[PDB]
Amino acid sequence: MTEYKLVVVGAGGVGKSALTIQLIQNHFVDEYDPTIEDSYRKQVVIDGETCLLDILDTAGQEEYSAMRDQYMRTGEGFLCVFAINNTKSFEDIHQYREQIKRVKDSDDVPMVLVGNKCDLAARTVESRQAQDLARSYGIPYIETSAKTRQGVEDAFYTLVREIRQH
Numbered sequence: 001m002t003e004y005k006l007v008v009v010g011a012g013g014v015g016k017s018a019l020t021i022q023l024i025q026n027h028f029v030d031e032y033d034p035t036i037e038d039s040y041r042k043q044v045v046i047d048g049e050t051c052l053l054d055i056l057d058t059a060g061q062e063e064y065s066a067m068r069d070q071y072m073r074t075g076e077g078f079l080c081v082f083a084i085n086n087t088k089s090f091e092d093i094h095q096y097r098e099q100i101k102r103v104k105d106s107d108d109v110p111m112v113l114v115g116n117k118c119d120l121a122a123r124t125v126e127s128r129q130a131q132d133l134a135r136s137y138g139i140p141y142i143e144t145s146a147k148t149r150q151g152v153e154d155a156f157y158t159l160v161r162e163i164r165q166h
Ligand SMILES: Nc1nc2c(ncn2[C@@H]2O[C@H](COP(=O)(O)OP(=O)(O)NP(=O)(O)O)[C@@H](O)[C@H]2O)c(=O)[nH]1
Pocket: 010, 011, 012, 013, 014, 015, 016, 017, 018, 019, 029, 030, 031, 032, 033, 034, 035, 036, 058, 059, 060, 061, 116, 117, 118, 119, 120, 144, 145, 146, 147, 148
C-alpha cells in the first residue's frame, strides 16, 4: 500500500481541523473546539494511484501544543495554514516552517502554504503577499474555504504531489 503521512500546522483558529474534516468527512465544522492532537486516515485515488492518507491535525493554541514536535516527526509533508483574515497567523508561518525544519532536520521538506477562510471578506492578507512568501520557500500557495469546500481537495492533493517530487 502507498501511504502518505500529512501534517496540518498553523496558528490557533485558522481552520486546520475544519479543513481536515471537510476533506475526510465532507462537512463543515462551524464550532470552535481547540485541538490537542487528532489523526485521520482515508483511502483515496490520487492521480491513478490508490493510497492511504494519514493526516495529523495539530494544535495551534500554545496551551494545547504539548509534544507537537514529537507528533510531527513522522510527517512526510506539511500543510502550513494561515487565515486570510488573520494577519498574525500569516506572520506566524515563518515560525511553523522553522519548527518543521527543526523536527525533520532538513531544509528540504515537502510543504504547501494554505490561505484559508477565503469565503470571508475581511481580507488582510492579499493573494500576492502570500504568493511571494510561498515563492521564497519554493512551494505552492493555495487558497481554501473549509466552509464552501473551495480548494480543499486541491490543497491536500497538491501536498501529495509535492511529496512525490522529493
Ligand atoms: N468562514 C469560515 N470559517 C472557517 C473556516 N475554517 C474554519 N472556520 C471556523 O473557524 C473556527 C476555527 O476553526 P478550527 O478548524 O477549529 O481551527 P483550528 O485551526 O483547527 N484551531 P486549533 O488550532 O485551536 O485546533 C471555527 O469556528 C470554524 O468554523 C473557513 O474556511 N471559513
